[PDB]
Amino acid sequence: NGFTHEGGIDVVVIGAGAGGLNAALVLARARRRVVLVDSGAPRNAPSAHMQGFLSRDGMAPSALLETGRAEVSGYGAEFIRGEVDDVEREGEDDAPRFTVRLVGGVALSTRRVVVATGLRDELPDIPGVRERWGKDLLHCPYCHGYEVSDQPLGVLGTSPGAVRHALLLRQWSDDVVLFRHGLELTDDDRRALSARQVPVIEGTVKRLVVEDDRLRGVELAEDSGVARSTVFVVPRMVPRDGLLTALGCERGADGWIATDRSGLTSVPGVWAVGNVVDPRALVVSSAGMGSAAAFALNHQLVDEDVASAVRAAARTVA
């Protein structure tokens, strides 16, 4: 059935976005035997160009990943395109080991695991939203705001974060409208929206209006329409942390898997980096936390390597 190497696998990195790739890069350069398993679904694949990553502003996501994979494979790390559906812990707390199992039946044994599986954007079920996602139905103002500066922007009231999102988007345009969509607004919400001059249009949103492959506006329940060039939503962002939960990784009060500042979880030998633990992590921040995880992980592997060697030398004792 399974995948083996005679020296033994040191780290399995689950997910090869920027988080997993930068973790693997540092670990492979540290002469650790790394296998990456990745299902091929980068969160920002719908957007043609990524922005805000130092020295790679405007780079295509596919190009970042192609370049990164080439770097990582050049150091001898191995890639599998597949889906991990189980990780099981073995051994003592001071010498962790894991079995990683893929859909289809392939399994690997490893000393450590880095989970870098990202998050899923659950979008509102409104006609046009799926089709335009990543083009002109968007979420992230840091990713897209500059590119739609001063344009007529809309925000759909499909999430409790919609009011704050409209106020945030006013930093990029003086023409921002909130489609309330029956969202409950507080007195503070209304005062803030009025003060920042964001109109609130009442009514159930029926569909996004798309003509000649571009968004033209938003249609309301009884056929009224409002022209917009770009519409924003706050999706329900769900981290792909099922493997971490199954391992017994503790969650913080906020509901996300808890980590220290290197990404180490409550389960010994298990690191987590990127959107799976931080919904605010842009691509370069995910890469940054991958590097930090690799730094800490290798350091602690050395501590185990030393402790095991000391143990063995004291057993044989000359």
Ligand X SMILES: Cc1cc2nc3c(=O)[nH]c(=O)nc-3n(C[C@H](O)[C@H](O)[C@H](O)COP(=O)(O)OP(=O)(O)OC[C@H]3O[C@@H](n4cnc5c(N)ncnc54)[C@H](O)[C@@H]3O)c2cc1C
- Write each residue from 17 to 36 as x if it is in contact with ligand X (CB under 6 A), else as -, in one continuous string: xxxx----------------
Q: Are 116 and 197 in contact (CB under 8 A)?
A: no
- Cβ-contact 17, 118 below 8 angstroms: yes
- Using CB distances below 5 to 8 A depending on partner kind, what does residue 97 bind out of ligand GSH, a second copy, ligand X, none? none
Q: Shortest gap between Cβ of 232 and ligand GSH (angstroms)? A: 9
Pair of tokens at residue 139: 């979420």
d(CA 19, CA 242): 18
Q: How far, in Å, are 110, 273, 298, 306, 312 from residue 302 at the CA level?
A: 15, 21, 6, 6, 15
Residue 193 Cβ vs a second copy, minimum distance, rounded to whole Å: 9
Site string for ligand GSH, 146-185 (x = CB under 6 A): ---------------x------x-----------------
DSSP assignment letter at 9: E
16 contact, one of ligand X, Cl ion, ligand GSH, none, CB 5-8 Å limit per kind: ligand X
Minimal distance in Å, beta carbon 2 to a second copy? 27
The two tokens of residue 195 are 């003060």
Return the residue of 107, 140, 258, 284 that touches ligand GSH, per CB under 6 A.
Answer: 140
Assess 141 for contact with ligand GSH (CB under 6 A): yes
Neighbouring C-beta atoms of residue 305, cutoff 10 Å: 11
Which DSSP string corresponds to 63-114? HHHHHHHHHHHHTT-EEEES-EEEEEEES-TTS-EEEEEETTS-EEEEEEEE
Sign of CA dihedral 39, 301, 78, 283: positive
Q: How far is the CB of 130 from a second copy (least distance, A)?
A: 27
Q: How far is the CB of 301 from ligand GSH (least distance, A)?
A: 12
Based on the shown chain and the rule CB under 8 A, indicate whether residue 75 belongs to the binding site for a second copy: yes
Q: Which is nearer to Cl ion, 77 or 163 (CB)?
A: 163
Which of 133, 89, 142, 132 is closest to 270 using CA atoms? 89
22 binds, among Cl ion, ligand X, a second copy, none (CB under 5 to 8 A by kind): a second copy
Q: CB-based contacts of 196: which residues, under 8 Å, 6+ apart?
A: 167, 170
Inter-helix orientation angle 283-316/18-29, to 10°: 40
Within residues 291-310, the interface with ligand GSH by CB under 6 A covers 299
CA 271 to CA 13: how far, in whole Å?
A: 9
Q: Which does 53 bind (CB under 5 to 8 A by kind): ligand X, ligand GSH, Cl ion, none?
A: ligand X
Determine the distance from the C-alpha atom of residue 43 to the mean position of all C-alpha atoms in its chain, rounded to a whole number.
6
36 binds, among a second copy, ligand GSH, Cl ion, none (CB under 5 to 8 A by kind): none
Q: How far apart are CA 213 and CA 246, in angstroms?
A: 43
d(CA 46, CA 48): 6
How big is the CA angle at 178 (ends 177 and 182), to the nearest 5 degrees?
Answer: 150
In the list 68, 128, 269, 274, the residue contacting ligand X (rule: CB under 6 A) is 274
CB of 62: closest distance to a second copy in angstroms?
Answer: 12
Stretch of residues binding ligand X (CB under 6 A), selected from 154-162, 188-196, 282-290, 306-314:
282-290
Q: Annotated binding site, which residues?
A: 19, 38, 41, 43, 51, 84, 139-140, 142-143, 275, 281, 283, 299
- Interface contacts to a second copy, rule CB under 8 A: 18, 21-22, 25-26, 29-31, 51-57, 59, 64, 67-68, 71, 75, 141-142, 145-146, 149, 167-168, 170-172, 191-192, 194-196, 261, 280-282, 284-292, 294-295, 298-299, 302, 305-306, 309-310, 312-314
Q: Which residues bind ligand X (CB under 6 A)?
A: 14-20, 37-44, 46-47, 50-53, 83-84, 116-118, 121, 134, 139-140, 143, 240, 274-275, 281-283, 286
